[PDB]
Write a protein that binds this ligand. Sequence first.
Ligand code: 3BH
Length: 377
Amino acid sequence: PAVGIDLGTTYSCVGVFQHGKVEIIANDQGNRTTPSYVAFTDTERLIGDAAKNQVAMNPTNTVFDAKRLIGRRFDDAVVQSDMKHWPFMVVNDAGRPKVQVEYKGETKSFYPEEVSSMVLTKMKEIAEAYLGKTVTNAVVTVPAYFNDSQRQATKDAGTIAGLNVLRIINEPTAAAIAYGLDKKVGAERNVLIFDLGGGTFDVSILTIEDGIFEVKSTAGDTHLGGEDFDNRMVNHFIAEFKRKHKKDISENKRAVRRLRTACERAKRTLSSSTQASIEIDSLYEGIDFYTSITRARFEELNADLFRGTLDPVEKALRDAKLDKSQIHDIVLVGGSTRIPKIQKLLQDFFNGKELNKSINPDEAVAYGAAVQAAILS
Ligand SMILES: Nc1ncnc2c1nc(N)n2[C@@H]1O[C@H](CO)[C@@H](O)[C@H]1O
């Protein structure tokens, strides 16, 4: 048995192709994705949901975003920038980062691939728990923009985890494979993959001919995601609370958290209904906050951000020397692509071209990796 693993920046996903169909595997908590989080305590190492859950109680010993570090030099522009907002320590070991933590009271240091190997170990165990079998063979995916060093450190993270990494496959290729875009025949096709998650936006153009892939271009915005959309909702409701109660809730961290959690939940509802209601009792100074938001108001609050996703798309086309008419297939990846307005902007931009969106966009990369893993095994 071989598994496909989407090793994601914030969440990871494992699938297995068995009995003619991909099964996306639920973890011990019943979650079909697992936070890419590792935490070190006085007594134990926590990975996944258990790690994410205690981040507030232990921020400096709880590691995430290791994929932003993996295979990079310490002085990489990216390593330097994201370092500013990570509560965990990143030390410089002869030009390449290690994370330093306190573990069983004893101060310990880890290469980014050692941390990623821990996440991969979790995904491996998640697979073994479901199957009741040993799992060694895996396909692991990476972003299309990853260099040799980033790809090799990812493969290494797997080997340390005890995986036999059959192949490192690009995430947009795996997404394409999930939709069987590689089974189409005759003429060369151009495929755009639109990947919008919680934090990041990635665009890729590939060519496929007779099931042979090539990456043509990549573009994006490394800080545009559903988290930005939540911010606009929060700002909207803080102003509303100010308007109706002449009270500023924004310096109360717990009130703002309640609102924000409520906001991202409402956002998800707005992807399948046209209004969402929120009741938060005793939000600030004992004042209840009952409110509602239409899909249209949500769209209005995010108008610039939503339209702005089209710019990396134009860039990707430019760099691939392709006209928007020369795109044959469009594939949706990432949770934020569930937004109808985003789908309409993309569906319209391509003159009304259809979209591959039937596979759960959170799971499509693991899906394709799992299909490829069974073929390669
Ligand atoms: N149905 C939905 N509508 C809008 N956004 C959704 C969404 N589902 C998810 N996960 N998201 C967002 O995807 C990101 C990664 O999970 C987060 O920003 C989620 O809110």
